[PDB]
Amino acid sequence: QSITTSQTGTNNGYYYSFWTNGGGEVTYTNGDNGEYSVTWVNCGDFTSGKGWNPANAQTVTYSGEFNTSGNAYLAVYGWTTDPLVEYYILESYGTYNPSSGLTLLGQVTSDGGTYDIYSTQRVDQPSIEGTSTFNQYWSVRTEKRVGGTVTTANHFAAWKALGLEMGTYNYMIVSTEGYESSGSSTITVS
């Protein structure tokens, strides 16, 4: 049922990943089908969500509720390997825009919205491969929204068209991530 330390697995047909670096209390609960719920209060950093692994650039439809007082992200979130990349298609966030001070590369239109595209390097940082160096790519929706359809293939295509290198898909989830914040989300992925 409800968990408080990091854990990955499969649940009702969905890959799920719950990662926390231990700070505050974060509680993660798998629901039915593609649903998950997470609630956090004064967290450190954590990421949580359902999706697929390995992913296949799914057109993802999600719905639900995401709220925070502080710094949190709602994004289609995953990784590639060879090369190693961490990426976000950021649909909503709280008090902090994570593209702040990142390199802007362009804009992409998809699913009725506009996203600005950014890249940064993460150097000797925690990863799905242990401590590693990798690029981190963002599509940040120019207006926040919680629910709709994300055609992740359009983002991946725009990133590569603009010159970003992408590897083989590893997991891809609809992630709630919190950072020094409190809040809650409940999200159904399909």
Author numbering: 34 to 223
Copy text verbatim from the article accompanying this structure deposition.
Xylanases (endo-1,4-β-xylanases; EC 3.2.1.8) catalyze the hydrolysis of β-1,4-xylosidic bonds of xylan, constituting a class of enzymes that are critical for the degradation of hemicellulosic polysaccharides in biomass. The overall structure of TcXylCΔN17 shows a β-jelly roll fold, as seen in other GH11 family xylanases. The two catalytic residues, nucleophile Glu119 in β-sheet B6 and proton donor Glu210 in β-sheet B4, are located in this cleft.
The gene encoding the GH11 xylanase C (TcXylC) with the highest activity was used for overproduction and purification of the recombinant enzyme, permitting solving of the crystal structure to a resolution of 1.98 Å. The thumb in A close represents the close form (closed active site cleft), while the thumb in B open represents the open form (open active site cleft). In the cleft of A close, 10 water molecules were observed, and a network of 31 hydrogen bonds were formed between the water molecules and 12 amino acid residues (Ser49, Asp78, Thr80, Tyr110, Trp112, Glu119, Tyr121, Arg155, Pro159, Tyr204, Ser208, and Glu210). In contrast, the cleft of B open included 7 water molecules and a network of 21 hydrogen bonds formed between the water molecules and 14 amino acid residues (Ser49, Thr80, Asn104, Tyr110, Trp112, Glu119, Tyr121, Pro131, Arg155, Gln169, Trp171, Tyr204, Ser208, and Glu210). Furthermore, because the values of B-factors of finger region in A close and thumb region in B open exhibit high values, these regions are able to fluctuate and are flexible. These results suggest that the tunnel has an open form in apo form as B open, and if the substrate binds to the active site cleft, the tunnel (close form) forms by replacing water molecules in A close.
